[PDB]
Design a protein around this ligand. Structure first.
Ligand SMILES: Nc1nc2c(ncn2[C@@H]2O[C@H](COP(=O)(O)OP(=O)(O)OP(=O)(O)O)[C@@H](O)[C@H]2O)c(=O)[nH]1
Ligand SMILES: Nc1nc2c(ncn2[C@@H]2O[C@H](COP(=O)(O)OP(=O)(O)O)[C@@H](O)[C@H]2O)c(=O)[nH]1
Ligand SMILES: COC(=O)Nc1nc2ccc(C(=O)c3ccccc3)cc2[nH]1
Ligand SMILES: [Ca+2]
Ligand SMILES: [Cl-]
Ligand SMILES: [Mg+2]
Ligand SMILES: [Mg+2]
Lengths: 440, 422, 59
């Protein structure tokens, strides 16, 4: 009951998915072969971890997940990796020619050749569900598959599953770890076409994750492996409420009620702490007050922006580990006296708190230190519009000269889709300003 | 998985083509018999891109050797690695082109083009997923320039959704005394502007100047010029051969379909008489290290790709690439954000611990086309040597069309050089 | 509740149609782009016949 299906699209979506499911398995005691000794109900069950894992008669715990990429090299590493026995072969779907960082090829030319098979494989996952809650879609903004095929999939999922909830984990492009120049185009195109079909989207700025890995984990030149292990921890904090249960546990859907005041304003700002190396965590216990204070340090945000220059519409705190309300309330009271936390005048100012007692895990050989307690803040702030502004401005610079547009037109798109998508973004930026204005 | 089909046409095309296969065969651990005897599995991971796995686990270049004379191709079969090439992939005639573009594009080459396509189809149909084609040729000759551009136009008819790349050798008075080379080059550029996705401008003027001024060779040979071409082609194809496809790479380098002519660069370039990451970066942005006789500081960069090879600090590479950009910001167009991208491959070339290969889409390339146009108009306004071409059936208009199309290419490069963000 | 069913069905309908129109408009545009490319290449082939014919006459 309350199953969630994860869909990982393109390289970034697939590789981040690999990190998430590895971490999930460790948190739940699932082995690389899908066996879970602690699970005494074989072949089924209604436990909390069954929201993300199905069970076969042979005791294998199978992710409720589909991996999709338009070329095979990234998913092949799953087919032959350590957790290869975790997935049935039909959960891993590949073409042979990718979208070449072209939204048009991912949404049209190449994507239309595989979209039917993908939906068929998702249906088979849905049919195993007794009360499907929704989908979690992982993808980059910048890739041609992550952008173009994701939009196509989201549009098709609205048709096949009505308004069943669809959440995104979206990788916002950063030049430090990208070798593509047309990513601003793909980002605006996919954001425009997906905006109506997504109920809530957590953007992850690769530059923010890049900086956190360098500053807090002392990694000289972070790789995707480094970024993804950190991203998996935030994703885990966000989905922990669905996979574990407890008296103080608050369901993610209940947080969403507070985070989305209007359908289009559905982009929460995530902030995670503590990110600390083993060398610094040694003889170092970070308290509830210390990790909570870290949530309001902008350097720990998942998206580069300044919330001090915006207004809050919601503040949620998702704790996990050794945390009790008494200390949370004390920490919050302290922060309210020392921080620039301004709410819009039409929204209450209380912070919404959930606690999952299961402590966080770390993957062996990683750089993150294992801690007794962590926290993910989910805030709805107008400051996240700064991320749209930076991306829209790069879009405008290239589109004024029509740079690279021929690649998209050559695959069937029209200039009208570019201007139509950019106008939708301009209205979104406008929407974020309007919500921050004081009432009459 | 992602196969490339290589073609080499004419004397030059076959010469540098053979050198290319010599160099990459060595890098992948393939001997002149086609057998693998390397020492790392990274050499075989993407060997399918350029080689077919044959019976007996021998690797055969996916290469097609073309010429209207058997002379050069006979040397290939006799030279080193002459036996790895598939014998049926030799498509030669006896007529010859006489350094006449018309003979290669229209007369002698048209009679042979069908037999060349027969080999292209048999190679292509054996590909799990064909990326596209790369052609090696010169633009001053007759076969490589005339029949090469014809092969491109006819391959595009059967494979219109595949990338077409060329390594085109531009003519220079410093290397060949033949007089009609500006005609053959201008007629070829007219074709390449329309039917290729990427063209590396391998400028003989720049190759000679490097061998003479830098490498200190009083009398550079074609072998000396080709050692530069071999090292360049190895560099630009490194990311394809060792662990993105031709299309993704063209997407990030070609902002406008006609402006797909690249300035190649390489570092280090040192003589036999007598290296840091900062020095590598500084050198590859120096005009002296460009394989095209153009000064990048006389124009602006639309896009740049740079690949470093060898064991080095990625952090230091990141710092120095940001360093050279900020100190040369004026030479990078503002309206294409983040237009300089960098890649690293742990496997260095032969005989070097570290190297860097530079791929620049610079408006300064107009200097190269301006030079060809000047030589062209200096002969066409007199109508000199035109009977070689009208004799094959061409009309003066086709010379006037090719001329004004290249002059348009120049003015198009100048347009975006002068464009600003605000 | 009827209004809720009608709004959800109308959202599903308009999305299905919006997509069907986008995918057909894109098919036509891509097919036209490739047809124009080849038509230019056939025109060159015809021009090559004229060149080879113009040679024959001179003989
Ligand atoms: N955080 C993170 N970002 C990634 C990862 N892989 C790729 N990206 C980012 O995603 C963008 C490129 O998109 P990709 O996902 O690689 O491309 P794709 O979705 O496979 O689409 P195509 O390859 O063009 O068909 C760049 O901005 C990368 O920095 C990853 O593993 N982790
Ligand atoms: N770098 C280099 N240039 C060459 C070579 N052979 C010919 N060229 C150049 O190519 C032009 C002559 O074209 P060529 O290929 O010989 O005519 P083709 O055999 O009919 O294609 C001249 O401008 C030469 O400078 C070579 O081996 N190396
Ligand atoms: C046979 O013809 C080709 O090889 N075509 C071709 N186009 C290319 C464009 C870029 C690169 C790179 O090395 C690179 C370096 C840094 C960032 C991104 C890419 C390599 C290419 N090869
Ligand atoms: Ca069970
Ligand atoms: Cl598959
Ligand atoms: Mg990809
Ligand atoms: Mg010759």
């Amino acid at each position: 009951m309350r199953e969630c299906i994860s869909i990982h699209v393109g390289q970034a979506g697939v590789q981040i998915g690999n990190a998430c499911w590895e971490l999930y398995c460790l948190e739940h005691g699932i082995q690389p072969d899908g066996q879970m000794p602690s699970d005494k109900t074989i072949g089924g069950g209604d436990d909390s971890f069954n929201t993300f894992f199905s069970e076969t008669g042979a005791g294998k715990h199978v992710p409720r997940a589909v991996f999709v990429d338009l070329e095979p090299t990234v998913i092949d590493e799953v087919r032959t990796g350590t957790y290869r026995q975790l997935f049935h072969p039909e959960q891993l779907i590949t073409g042979k020619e990718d979208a070449a960082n072209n939204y048009a090829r991912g949404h049209y030319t190449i994507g239309k050749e595989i979209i039917d098979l993908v939906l068929d494989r998702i249906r088979k996952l849905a049919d195993q569900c007794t009360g499907l809650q929704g989908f979690l879609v992982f993808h980059s903004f910048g890739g041609g598959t992550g952008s173009g095929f994701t939009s196509l999939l989201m549009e098709r999922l609205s048709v096949d599953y009505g308004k069943k909830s669809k959440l995104e984990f979206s990788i916002y492009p950063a030049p430090q770890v990208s070798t593509a120049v047309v990513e601003p185009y793909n980002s605006i195109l996919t954001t425009h076409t997906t905006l109506e079909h997504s109920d809530c989207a957590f953007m992850v700025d690769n530059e923010a994750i890049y900086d956190i890995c360098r500053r807090n984990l002392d990694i000289e030149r972070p790789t995707y492996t480094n970024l993804n292990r950190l991203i998996s921890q935030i994703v885990s904090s966000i989905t922990a409420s669905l996979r574990f249960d407890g008296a103080l546990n608050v369901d993610l859907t209940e947080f969403q009620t507070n985070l989305v005041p209007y359908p289009r304003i559905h982009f929460p700002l995530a902030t995670y702490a503590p990110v600390i190396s083993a060398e610094k965590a040694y003889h170092e216990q970070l308290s509830v007050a210390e990790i909570t204070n870290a949530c309001f340090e902008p350097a720990n945000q998942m998206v580069k922006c300044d919330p001090r220059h915006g207004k809050y519409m919601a503040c949620c705190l998702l704790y996990r580990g050794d945390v009790v309300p008494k200390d949370v309330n004390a920490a919050i009271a302290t922060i309210k006296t020392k921080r620039s936390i301004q709410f819009v005048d039409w929204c209450p100012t209380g912070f919404k708190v959930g606690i999952n007692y299961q402590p966080p895990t770390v993957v062996p050989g990683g750089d993150l230190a294992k801690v007794q307690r962590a926290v993910c803040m989910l805030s709805n702030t107008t400051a996240i519009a700064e991320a749209w502004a930076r991306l829209d401005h790069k879009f405008d610079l290239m589109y004024a000269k029509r740079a690279f547009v021929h690649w998209y037109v050559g695959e069937g798109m029209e200039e009208g889709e570019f201007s139509e998508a950019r106008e939708d973004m301009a209205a979104l930026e406008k929407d974020y300003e309007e919500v921050g204005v004081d009432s009459v | 998985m992602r196969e490339i089909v290589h073609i080499q046409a004419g004397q030059c095309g076959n010469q540098i083509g053979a050198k290319f296969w010599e160099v990459i065969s060595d890098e992948h651990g393939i001997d002149p018999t086609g057998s693998y005897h390397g020492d790392s599995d990274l050499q075989l991971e993407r060997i399918n891109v350029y080689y077919n796995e044959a019976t007996g686990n021998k690797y055969v270049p996916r290469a097609i050797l073309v010429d209207l004379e058997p002379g050069t191709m006979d040397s290939v079969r006799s030279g080193p690695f002459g036996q790895i090439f598939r014998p049926d992939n030799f498509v030669f005639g006896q007529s010859g082109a006489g350094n006449n573009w018309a003979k290669g594009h229209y007369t002698e080459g048209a009679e042979l083009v069908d037999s060349v396509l027969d080999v292209v189809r048999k190679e292509s149909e054996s590909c799990d997923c064909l990326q596209g084609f790369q052609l090696t040729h010169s633009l001053g000759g007759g076969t490589g320039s005339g029949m090469g551009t014809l092969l491109i136009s006819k391959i595009r008819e059967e494979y219109p959704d595949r990338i077409m790349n060329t390594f085109s050798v531009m003519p220079s008075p410093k290397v060949s005394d033949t007089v009609v080379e500006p005609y053959n080059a201008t007629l070829s550029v007219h074709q390449l502007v329309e039917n290729t996705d990427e063209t590396y401008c391998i400028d003989n003027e720049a190759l000679y100047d490097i061998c003479f001024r830098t490498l200190k060779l009083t009398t550079p040979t074609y072998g000396d010029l080709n050692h530069l071409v071999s090292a360049t082609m190895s560099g630009v194809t490194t990311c394809l051969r060792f662990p993105a496809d031709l299309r993704k790479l063209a997407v990030n380098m070609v902002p406008f379909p006609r402006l797909h002519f690249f300035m190649p660069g390489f570092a280090p370039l040192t003589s036999r008489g007598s290296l840091t990451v900062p020095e590598l970066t500084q050198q590859m942005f120096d005009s002296k290290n460009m394989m095209a006789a153009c000064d990048p500081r006389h124009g602006r960069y639309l896009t740049v790709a740079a690949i470093f090879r060898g064991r080095m600090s990625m952090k230091e590479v990141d710092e120095q690439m940001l360093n050279v950009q900020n100190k040369n910001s004026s030479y990078f167009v503002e309206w294409i954000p983040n237009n300089v991208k960098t890649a690293v491959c742990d496997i260095p070339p032969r005989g070097l611990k570290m190297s860097a290969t530079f791929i620049g889409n610079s408006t300064a390339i107009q200097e190269l086309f301006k030079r060809i146009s000047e030589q062209f108009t200096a002969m066409f306004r007199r109508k000199a040597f035109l009977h070689w071409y009208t004799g094959e059936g061409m009309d003066e208009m086709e010379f006037t069309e090719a001329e004004s199309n290249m002059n348009d290419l120049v003015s198009e490069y100048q347009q975006y050089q002068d464009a600003t963000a605000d | 509740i009827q209004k809720a069913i009608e709004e959800n069905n109308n959202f599903i309908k308009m999305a299905k149609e919006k997509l069907a129109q986008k995918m057909e408009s894109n098919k036509e545009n891509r097919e036209a782009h490739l047809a124009a490319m080849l038509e230019r290449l056939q025109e060159k082939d015809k021009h090559a016949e004229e060149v080879r014919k113009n040679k024959e006459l001179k003989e």
